[PDB]
């Protein structure tokens, strides 16, 4: 999955 | 001349600072997949003939010390300078493993006046990090 | 004499005030695109033009996937900030 | 779909946090440069490359002249902020 | 590749030129700005943009104008150009009577609020201060 | 003369 940075 | 002189003995340095793990005090979760990035950058800049240097998990202080030391180095024989920052962040801020660090502070070590051996040469900063908490939903083309 | 702030280029992974996206296994969308575009065009296109390609690849080929509706289906646009005074070519 | 912030280009006359200069007679250094460079290269150079030339002209050919020592002999560098996804040409096929 | 620039029209070019400000602002007349505005008009005219010059607009009128422009139909235009000539600060542009954040103006042209410009280049040329720092330069 | 904006 994609996560925030 | 419309192009930067890139025919020096060396292309220059390529400092890659990859911060994956953070102090419990910060709260940010680990950055999984960031090693894949640091590794990808290393190989890419190696093909472009840059002298790559990886630095993992650096504290806010260790980041400033590194940048200052690199800026005080002699780049007379290098065409340019590349600096990659992979970490968490806010607008104008980059996160060290222990706390916040302003971006303007890092780049300033490389201003034409503070780094004579890089005056007139390309100084690139690639920053992978957030710059706020806004979400882009997009729109249908 | 030249400006002390000249010859700097800032390639931001995302627009000011926005979240930057990263894939847990593949890595950050920006670095992925940037490395891919660099591998493919460094021997041809000027840097700004290569960064424009990174902008398009990130903007069109990426979309967030999250189990939380809040962070799901989000997009990203990188932000190039240039104070360069000449064209940047990695080749000779 | 695409980002709502995509396809935006911000041509800033100066660097973030800095003063922008204007000649009391010929106008702003940036606009003068921008117009000369466009008139000279809009028929063959891509926009980003044109703004780079504007960057060089402003940074190299302008220096402030003021009776106030504080604002005298100062320099300026424009700031290109691009969210463009393609190349921008003002000419046709 | 490149943006499609072969629509019936290149687009609109809005020039907001503010020379005189209300004394409360503390900014004296921006002499030389008319030369700029005229220069820009002639330049964009040769690039085939429909130029619209607007002089001395209050902050309310600047937002009013941009809102109206973002609601016109740009379907037959290749792009959009906006030039703001005035005093300013970081992220801020000045109307004759007060400040207005640039973010508020450009947001009218976001891909989702101006459908006729989606996927089309939107250029914002900003002549204005972005703070009070001075660049002393360095020699070579 | 040159003035700031």
């Amino acid at each position: 999955v994609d996560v925030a940075x | 001349d419309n192009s930067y002189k890139m025919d020096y003995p060396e292309m220059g340095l390529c400092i890659i600072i990859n911060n994956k793990n953070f102090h419990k005090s910060t709260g940010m979760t680990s950055r999984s997949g960031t090693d894949v990035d640091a590794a990808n950058l290393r190989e890419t800049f190696r093909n472009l003939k840059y002298e790559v240097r990886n630095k993992n998990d650096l504290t806010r202080e260790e980041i400033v010390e590194l940048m200052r030391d690199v800026s005080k180095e002699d780049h007379s024989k290098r065409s340019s300078f590349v600096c990659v920052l992979l970490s968490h962040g806010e607008e104008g801020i980059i996160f060290g493993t222990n706390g916040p660090v302003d971006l303007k502070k890092i780049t300033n070590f490389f201003r034409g006046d503070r780094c004579r051996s890089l005056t007139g040469k390309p100084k690139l900063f690639i920053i992978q990090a957030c710059r706020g908490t806004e979400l882009d939903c997009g729109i249908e083309t | 004499k030249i400006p002390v702030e000249a010859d700097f280029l800032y390639a931001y992974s995302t627009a000011p005030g926005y979240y930057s996206w990263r894939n847990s296994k593949d890595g950050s969308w920006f670095i992925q695109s940037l490395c891919a575009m660099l591998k493919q065009y460094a021997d041809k296109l000027e840097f700004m033009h290569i960064l424009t390609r990174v902008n398009r690849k990130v903007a069109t080929e990426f979309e967030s996937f999250s189990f939380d509706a809040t962070f799901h289906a989000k997009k990203q646009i990188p932000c190039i900030v240039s104070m360069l005074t000449k064209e940047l070519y990695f080749y000779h």
Side-chain angles (χ1 to χ4, degrees), chain A, chain B, chain C:
Chain A
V1 275
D2 302 298
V3 293
Chain B
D1 25 52
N2 303 306
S3 286
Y4 280 114
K5 177 190 174 62
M6 298 300 283
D7 48 291
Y8 281 80
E10 306 174 56
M11 281 293 281
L13 301 178
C14 176
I15 310 309
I16 301 174
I17 293 129
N18 185 57
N19 276 352
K20 198 161 90 77
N21 311 300
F22 296 74
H23 192 168
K24 298 170 172 54
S25 302
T26 65
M28 294 89 75
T29 54
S30 193
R31 299 181 58 250
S32 57
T34 192
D35 296 6
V36 180
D37 298 314
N40 206 356
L41 289 166
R42 185 188 188 74
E43 171 57 14
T44 304
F45 282 104
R46 183 187 72 70
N47 287 302
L48 305 183
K49 312 307 176 191
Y50 277 81
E51 183 185 313
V52 182
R53 300 187 193 175
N54 278 74
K55 266 72 193 58
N56 294 68
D57 308 298
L58 281 296
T59 60
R60 75 204 301 182
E61 305 108 302
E62 293 192 296
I63 288 178
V64 177
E65 178 173 58
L66 171 63
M67 292 301 98
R68 194 177 59 206
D69 279 56
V70 181
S71 74
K72 278 189 163 184
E73 253 188 292
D74 176 291
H75 304 255
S76 298
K77 304 186 64 199
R78 299 170 193 158
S79 298
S80 55
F81 180 66
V82 182
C83 178
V84 193
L85 301 174
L86 300 164
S87 179
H88 273 294
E90 303 169 355
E91 178 61 54
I93 301 179
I94 182 67
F95 267 98
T97 61
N98 71 324
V101 170
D102 292 69
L103 273 170
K104 194 70 183 179
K105 183 179 180 176
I106 294 171
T107 60
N108 279 343
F109 292 125
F110 304 89
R111 302 196 324 179
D113 53 313
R114 283 77 164 298
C115 188
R116 318 293 283 82
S117 55
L118 282 177
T119 310
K121 296 175 175 168
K123 292 171 286 297
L124 337 174
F125 294 76
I126 304 172
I127 311 88
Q128 162 55 58
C130 290
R131 304 183 70 188
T133 60
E134 217 49 51
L135 291 165
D136 199 327
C137 294
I139 180 69
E140 274 263 354
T141 295
Chain C
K1 211 169 72 171
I2 61 170
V4 305
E5 231 79 11
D7 309 312
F8 272 91
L9 173 71
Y10 306 87
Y12 290 107
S13 70
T14 194
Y18 284 82
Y19 276 116
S20 177
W21 289 96
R22 162 171 47 70
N23 182 288
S24 30
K25 79 168 186 300
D26 300 346
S28 75
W29 304 351
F30 189 59
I31 300 309
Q32 263 182 268
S33 308
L34 179 64
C35 287
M37 290 304 93
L38 268 174
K39 207 89 57 187
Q40 206 186 317
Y41 301 102
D43 45 284
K44 309 194 293 182
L45 306 177
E46 185 274 328
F47 197 38
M48 290 304 99
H49 287 189
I50 293 170
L51 287 176
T52 299
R53 306 247 172 182
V54 173
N55 275 8
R56 186 164 75 240
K57 188 178 151 62
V58 167
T60 63
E61 296 161 39
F62 287 88
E63 189 142 342
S64 73
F65 182 95
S66 173
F67 298 133
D68 186 303
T70 304
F71 305 80
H72 176 70
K74 304 306 188 192
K75 305 288 296 185
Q76 176 169 314
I77 175 71
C79 178
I80 311 166
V81 183
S82 169
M83 270 145 286
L84 294 182
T85 57
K86 302 187 169 63
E87 285 168 36
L88 224 191
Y89 289 109
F90 291 110
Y91 62 89
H92 315 307

